[PDB]
Structure 1
Amino acid sequence: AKSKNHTNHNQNRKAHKNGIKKPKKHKFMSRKGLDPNFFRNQKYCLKGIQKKKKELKLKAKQEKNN
């Protein structure tokens, strides 16, 4: 038989029963497929920083030990 082949009727209402949900907004979007080269540089930097931190910690420990 012939049909109500399309309607956007009530759709808005349906949507608004659980609100138009926003994205949750996370502080750290993945840098997965984004700017290469730069991001590897960043990674390297981070690693360096971590190493430095670790060294500092080690030094502190040594000091504590005497």
Structure 2
Amino acid sequence: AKSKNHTNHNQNRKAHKNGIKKPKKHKFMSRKGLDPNFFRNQKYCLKGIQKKKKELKLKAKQEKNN
């Protein structure tokens, strides 16, 4: 029995019935494997700034908590 080998009819209407879906567009994009030896430095940067901020936080907390 001969069978229709292809069609693309009604496909666009089916697509637009639910509306063309958009990606969620989140804010941050992961750095799992992007250009290392730069984020390698950046992680140490973040660790250092966090360490300074948190040690100052603990110093203030102690000098206010006696």
Pairwise mapping of residues 1-66 of structure 1 onto structure 2 (< 5 A)? 1-66=1-66
Tell me the TM-score normalised to structure 2 length.
0.90
Q: Distance in 2 between matches of 1:18 and 1:37?
A: 44
DSSP 3-state at the match of 2:27: coil
Segments ≥4 residues shifted beyond 3 Å: none
5+ residue gaps, structure 2: none
Post-superposition shift, 1:65? 2.4
Deviation at 1:21, TM superposition (A): 0.8
In the TM superposition, residue 52 of structure 1 has moved relative to its aligned partner by 0.8
- CA offset digits 1:24-44 (Å, max 9, x no partner): 001111111111011111111
Aligned-pair Cα RMSD in Å: 1.0
- Report the count of equivalent residues: 66
Q: TM-score, normalised by structure 1?
A: 0.90
